[PDB]
Design an enzyme around this catalytic site. Structure first.
Site, PDB file in Angstrom:
ATOM      1  N   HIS A  12       4.911   9.966  -3.382  1.00  0.00           N
ATOM      2  CA  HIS A  12       4.434  10.626  -2.164  1.00  0.00           C
ATOM      3  C   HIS A  12       4.742  12.118  -2.107  1.00  0.00           C
ATOM      4  CE1 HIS A  12       2.878   7.088  -0.330  1.00  0.00           C
ATOM      5  NE2 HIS A  12       4.047   6.485  -0.255  1.00  0.00           N
TER       6      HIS A  12
ATOM      7  N   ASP B 264       5.986  -3.186  -3.816  1.00  0.00           N
ATOM      8  CA  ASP B 264       5.794  -3.536  -2.420  1.00  0.00           C
ATOM      9  C   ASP B 264       4.429  -4.152  -2.131  1.00  0.00           C
ATOM     10  OD1 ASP B 264       4.634  -1.069  -3.081  1.00  0.00           O
ATOM     11  OD2 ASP B 264       5.762   0.022  -1.522  1.00  0.00           O
TER      12      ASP B 264
ATOM     13  N   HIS C 147       1.101   1.476  -1.594  1.00  0.00           N
ATOM     14  CA  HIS C 147       0.677   2.694  -0.916  1.00  0.00           C
ATOM     15  C   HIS C 147      -0.032   3.626  -1.892  1.00  0.00           C
ATOM     16  CE1 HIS C 147       4.332   1.324   1.322  1.00  0.00           C
ATOM     17  NE2 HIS C 147       3.532   1.520   2.354  1.00  0.00           N
TER      18      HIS C 147
ATOM     19  N   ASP D 218       1.895   0.471  -6.798  1.00  0.00           N
ATOM     20  CA  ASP D 218       2.504   0.509  -5.473  1.00  0.00           C
ATOM     21  C   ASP D 218       1.457   0.217  -4.398  1.00  0.00           C
ATOM     22  OD1 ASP D 218       3.482   2.052  -2.921  1.00  0.00           O
ATOM     23  OD2 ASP D 218       5.263   1.911  -4.215  1.00  0.00           O
TER      24      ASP D 218
HETATM   25  K   LIG Z   1      -0.831   2.762  -5.379  1.00  0.00           K
HETATM   26 ZN   LIG Z   2       5.125   2.118  -1.478  1.00  0.00          ZN
END
Ligand SMILES: [K+]
Ligand SMILES: [Zn+2]
Ligand SMILES: [K+]
Ligand SMILES: [K+]
Ligand SMILES: [K+]
Ligand SMILES: [Zn+2]
Ligand SMILES: [Zn+2]
Ligand SMILES: [Zn+2]
EC number: 3.5.1.98
Lengths: 351, 353, 356, 344
Positions: free
Chosen positions: B130, B257, B168, B166
């Protein structure tokens, strides 16, 4: 030339803890707002007192006191959402500029006063300074304003600078900065309680080191809440006699008002009449020329009345047993360094 | 020839100091649990080479991040605690922990690419994907995967692949490589039309200028996605585009996750799914790849999933062959956009049974 | 109806929720009420062994018995914004102001109906919670202090002495702030504390009130996590019930958080429904079972449904040795509170009569 | 020439750094004040005015009390959102009050002749705030406040020219029925799919003020200097001349500029500067120019400076758009036939 200057800038109100909290921090923007409103109403400032232009201090002036690391650390907090140097010392993104304005105001007032552009001055500034050491921010303080003023003054030509710290807490940061230094005399009166009162430094026998011995004078109360009678007594018997023997070229008051009656942190009992009297007493060392710098003080009513009383003096407008014991112990220690204290010693011995 | 694992206990020291009502999910126990499960499995230490952990240098971080960003992160070592955003903390040990995490990734990429080892797993925190050019965010201080990519290029890798599984979207990684074509960025993630953190990475965020088509986003529209949808997207999107790209170096941003039981992702990937995804990518560069830990917040799930992945890196009932309707529609939407930049997909896209 | 139990509830309290997309969901969420309501329906408890009460928004005048006018105006203005934050963890959306007002309204009307004897006792199934809201500020997921409002509403209706027992795992810094100088209200709070390293950091054992309020805030702070039933029972036997019996209240409020429950991700303690049952029954002694129970925190849906059902069964009429850390906490509280509750000498002696 | 500015408008910002950072950010004012500083003015050739916070009494000439109260209660919150894309923090209410106060004090001074003209260098922008809604990055409608403050000082007829790339839906809503204020908007519109999808060509006033809202809705993107000056000399200036205003306000956005990431049009500082000169013909260069949008830092610094100089001294798709406007507007502006004839 004969005027009193007040250093103030609204951008220092931007330094604050990040959000509202179960226990809100006592060092808060309302401290300056409350004093500034009470000086406005009295006609003191704006009015009888002169303003000075607010300038951000330079890294070079700060490095006369602090390491480049510490100055860069404080500056960089402006890129964080919020941060804590220690558990009780906060910063937001506006804190670095506030701190540079507090130190710059002190620097310019110190120059203006010492070189004779104005008679005296009050730095109405935030955050406080006297717990910040050479390389550490702590105790709500980011940069040591009083020590910066002293070194700006020395640089302008003052040989001997006196700092009197009547904040209820010991100025551990200031004493660290001038520990081995004898061109600066540091005198602090503070609650100590055998070392249980924050910051637990500044016992009476902490007199300086390594060539600076005798030039750190600590007057440490064994209890609260000490009142006017004990401060004036310690001023008559310790502060003035030592200050007079030292004979300073420049006088800085570290004026915390947390020893005032009603303060939630200090729990002492000094009135505006006390601060008034102490200001007058110090005036007779340099003919009313002095820089008064705000440190602590957290009851808005108490600090408004006390600061107004002090600035009015700048404008020209029997102790307790605990107090005796503190003075007695201080003179026992400082006698070896300030022989002229014998006179005061014999007068104390007469009770 | 061997598998390397990058690890250092000093990354355990990064934690949330301030007293908060909700405990932070990005916590030292994540690394403890994986390390403990690898030790009892006899995988690490034991069968993997524990490379020497080195703090990355500022100059290395600056082929990805700004100088200001690196100094901001480094200065938190002088603070009791601090925040870059409201969810991204640092304490006095965080700068070293982030330097170690990036430093392990840097040295694994070098060793893997130059052939000193066959492959490797970076058991690191804080996560990285991120953090952008300029800002730390979403629990991430420096972008470990981007750093490993640029370190690999400096060692001669001309084409680097990053596959990010991931749950996200790695907005930081995409922002770093948005205009690059020497790096191919493929991210699978829950998206729900922008209502899932961090809200970036729709199918049509494809890159810019030099880089159209070198960011491939596979955004799920709902949240119970299982192995079958991941394998289906891998068969029809990831592996066809990655094979057309033909990378010299392969990086996996391996968040766990999306795993069954994770409280943040709430998807349903199992260790068998992570295993099979690692094998499929292993056929791109002869089993040579760097797997880097990002997210994953359920201690049992990440332990089981990291062990399965690492056992595949060591040489090791089926997953269903039909995707969910939501999974199939996601793949259709991706091919519709990407077919323009990857004509080789017309083969694939005649998946129309 | 004067021997009945009432349950206060309104579906508009479910519209208060976090709109911003965060990496982590907010634990204070509409599902909390949904799970408890569904579980009470399944158990035949409500409806309809329990009576409903008409939901009504609290007035600004009633809220001002506790809060500043400006705090009430601030909360209300959030109804004109898409979403807002009072602190980083305390959100609002356009429905929150009404929800907070319904929560306080239900508590106010329950407190009135209970104290005047229209009903015997009651459970306020409300959100947002309340006990972190101070005189001036929303925080800790709370917008208005529901329990403080119930206490002052009951005082306006004739209750002279009000007891609030707060077993939420967090210390109710807002309730304590409101009653810090008050002795007509006794606030007793059990909470994890760990020397201040547990949210919200307030409520050490020696924070006992000020001015004439000295002795009328009683904090039972756990030094550790994982506190179970036996420690809560032990502290009720030797601290809570003795002090409450000496105070002798006309009206009893329970700030019932269930975030000390086994399974709660924010408390990580271990109270079971049996412990909540027993604590409710012990408090029933003080008052013939006339009490108001107000939902505060509690974030694991399965745990709060079990514990709330068990507590409400007691309102309907239905291990003895502490941990080492539990004993130490009770000893430190007795040593402080003896200055204000000398009759704790009796409970001190009983305690010493058991080892080890 | 005056310049309104205050650094407390820099305090308005989103709460924390996000994956998708907000384009309406304090840097916008920092870039302009820099490019102005280097070529000083500013500071230098232009006067500086003292910044006053607009009062509620003035704001309520334009906005409902509902709206004014919502905006300044946000100073009691950590952060808030009026809409998905319109934020506030603790300082937003003061910043918006300073921006409106600056515009109001320029408007009084410029109209009463205390200075020839002025530039209000303000944040947040205004032209999307309506009677009741903060939206499109805008909290209070600065242009609207300046027009009503001007009238309160005896200006009987006020023209607002809005060349921000977006339609000023807030400004139009405030003045939809008034004929004492003429609102001319040039904006990208693309059939109602470019934000905010309002300001069609046929959306003149109503009902007392039909013909007093003049919308020039671009066909497409990439609109350039040629089209804008074409419409200024065939639409704006003709209709403005017939109006004959006492006070002229430019809602000067710069998001139609070359390189702007939201507008994607090709106007250059040449176009902006000549557009400014053309309107200077009316009222003798006595204008209040109010910063609205514009998000590429170097473009808006270029174009704003181009504009401030002037105040000191110094096609196919666009064609149909103009004739589309003339068809609609000539009924309310007979003098338009002179410019219509030129087409030809
Ligand atoms: K991802
Ligand atoms: Zn994540
Ligand atoms: K002192
Ligand atoms: K509690
Ligand atoms: K426009
Ligand atoms: Zn102090
Ligand atoms: Zn709680
Ligand atoms: Zn615009």
């Amino acid at each position: 030339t004969s005027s009193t200057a007040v250093g103030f800038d609204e951008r220092m109100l931007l330094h604050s803890e990040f959000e509202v909290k179960a226990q809100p921090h006592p060092e808060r923007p309302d401290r300056l707002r409350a004093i500034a409103a009470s000086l406005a109403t009295a006609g003191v400032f704006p009015g009888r007192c002169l303003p000075i232009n607010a300038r951000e201090i330079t890294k070079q002036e700060l490095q006369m006191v602090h390491t480049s690391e510490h100055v860069d650390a404080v500056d960089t907090t402006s890129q964080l959402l919020y941060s804590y140097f220690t558990s009780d010392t906060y910063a937001n993104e506006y804190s670095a500029r506030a701190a540079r304005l507090a130190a710059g105001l002190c620097a310019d007032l110190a120059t203006d006063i010492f070189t004779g552009r104005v008679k005296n001055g009050f730095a109405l500034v935030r955050p406080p300074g006297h717990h910040a050491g050479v390389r550490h921010a702590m105790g709500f303080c980011l940069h040591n304003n009083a020590a910066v003023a002293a070194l700006v003054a020395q640089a302008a030509g003052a040989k001997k600078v006196l700092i009197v710290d009547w904040d209820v807490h010991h100025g551990n940061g200031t004493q660290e900065i001038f520990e081995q230094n004898k061109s600066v005399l540091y005198i602090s009166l503070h609650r100590h309680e055998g070392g249980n009162f924050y910051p637990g430094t500044g016992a009476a026998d902490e007199v300086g080191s390594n060539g600076g011995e005798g030039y750190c004078v600590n007057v440490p109360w064994s209890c609260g809440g000490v009142g006017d009678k004990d401060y004036i007594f310690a001023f008559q018997h310790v502060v003035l006699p030592i200050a007079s023997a030292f004979s300073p070229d420049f006088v800085i008051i570290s004026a915390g008002f947390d020893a005032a009656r009603g303060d939630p942190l200090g729990c002492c009992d000094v009135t505006p009449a006390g601060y008034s009297r102490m200001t007058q007493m110090l005036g007779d060392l340099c003919g009313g020329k002095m820089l008064v710098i705000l440190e602590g003080g957290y009851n808005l009513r108490s600090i408004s009345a006390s600061a107004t009383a002090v600035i009015k003096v700048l404008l020209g407008e029997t102790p307790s047993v605990a107090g005796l014991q503190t003075v007695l112990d201080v003179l026992n220690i400082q006698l070896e360094f300030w022989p002229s204290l014998a006179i005061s010693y014999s007068k104390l011995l007469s009770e």
